[model samples]
Target: YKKPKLLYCSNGGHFLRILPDGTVDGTRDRSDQHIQLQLSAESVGEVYIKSTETGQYLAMDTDGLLYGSQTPNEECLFLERLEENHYNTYISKKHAEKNWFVGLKKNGSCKRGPRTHYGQKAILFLPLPVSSD
Candidate 1:
């Protein structure tokens, strides 16, 4: 089932928010700003995430950049994980031999996959429930 939630990053303390240009960026989890998004997952835990505001799938390229894709393709496969510290991780899995990671800089910009790893102290995310009321 598709579990709709908002992804909150462990560091930088921001929400994985999207920009109107289909630029999937980050938003500061402050009182003045926030955005909503939807998530879907299979039994294996690989999930597909998109913005309710844009309907774009957050996919990563082989070169390790995260972007919005028009369709739910193989590149859109993001494996989920629940880290030890109540945090979670998003992995960009594609090539069978290797996989990338979901990363973002402290500046709230995309941190390429090659630049991240399992416990790199960066790009870890915590999926939180959303609100419409």
Candidate 2:
């Protein structure tokens, strides 16, 4: 789907929030500033995530660190993978072989790294409520 979405992490039960300072974090508690992301189709199964709050794209650097960027590049692209539990995991296409997926660290900050054996921090794309027009 090319629609916008808010990512909810099963580990923290929070939505991914992109702070004004460009800090990527997660919060179980909702706020007006919660980050909203738009997924635009890139290739067969890849897409780029753009933050509606800051107009910056979510991207990973060479160090496998997650951040927001004003420009859309290959590092900003991700591939969606379906998990056995019916949840979707977002894997960085830039770090394909390394198995780097969007995950939350102990401090609730966003990080791109290999999935743990337990998969505790996998980023799940939960559907936002549809508007009733």
Candidate 3:
């Protein structure tokens, strides 16, 4: 299999909120639903999501993208708070694209306006893998 593209970026500054109930939360206002493609991988890759809403998350990285017939929403995925501002997402080997969708854990968390851009704050980190000859 051909090597996939590598996308890298720095870790931006995000407000890390620690609750009194021993919970860790991060700003997830402009969260996005991204698809991570695992090509020629040994064990299935795992995804970790941390937020300021629910510390816990909904984990299911076994099943890939599954497009249903009834409520299409079910195919996409619906996230629920497990703690304060943290979440865990996953995809199985059922759908065509082994992708994932991520977003804010609350409503008011993401601000919708012209100038005020309030949403999930994350820095894209590109992995540096060894070259294959």
Candidate 4:
């Protein structure tokens, strides 16, 4: 569980990835760079994502958009949930509700926070351990 990995969306066939410039998005390639992320625990069921290459945290805004922050704040906290479908979801902890999930579309774009819901295909992720190669 301590390994760095890619948050792969089985629905979108994409991996959640962050850019060197701190942009977060989805990419279809398994070998794509920027997909390896370290999950650090803040509390039980709460975790924060850090892109390995960029060394930035995954943070969400009040409006539900995702970004990368070099330093973490409450906005960087995400509550990881095991879904009914048995996949995983990360909802923004700062939102103070069961809202604002991390979502990705089939076309390798993001589904912004407010538009995502728990158990939705857009929010499901199956974590894959990072490849050595």
The candidate that achieves the highest lDDT relative to the unseen native structure: 4
Position 122, candidate 4: lDDT: 80
RMSD values for the candidates in order, in angstroms, are: 3.5, 3.6, 14.4, 3.1
For residues 53-117, what per-residue lDDT tens digits would candidate 2 score against the true structure? 56778877777778877877877788876674656676778777775776776556775555522
lDDT of 2 at 106: 55
> Relative to the true structure, how large is the alpha-carbon lDDT of every model?
0.67, 0.66, 0.26, 0.76
lDDT of 2 at 34: 52
Estimate, for each residue in 18-131, the C-alpha lDDT of model 3 and write its tens digit. Answer: 233323223332122221122222234433322223233222223321121221123323322122133222232223253333221232121111221122332122323323
TM-score of each: 0.81, 0.79, 0.20, 0.86
Is 1 or 2 the stronger prediction by TM-score?
1
Top model number, TM-score: 4
Better of 2 and 4 by TM-score: 4
Greater lDDT among 2 and 3 belongs to 2
Task: Give the poorly placed runs of model 3, Cα more than 4 Å off.
Answer: 1-12, 15-25, 28-44, 47-55, 59-98, 103-133
Residue-level lDDT tens digits of model 4 in 1-53: 23366678867588888888876888887577677777677999998888755
Q: Indicate the TM-score of model 3.
A: 0.20
Model 4, residue 32: distance off in Å is 0.8
lDDT by residue for model 1 (1-133), tens: 1334567776676778666565566677623232555656754878776666567787777887778788776566778788747777777657324667766777777777675776666668776664631
* Stronger candidate by lDDT (2 vs 4): 4
Candidate 4, run of 10 with poorest lDDT: 1-10
Candidate 4 regions with alpha-carbon error over 4 angstroms: 1-3, 84-86, 130-133
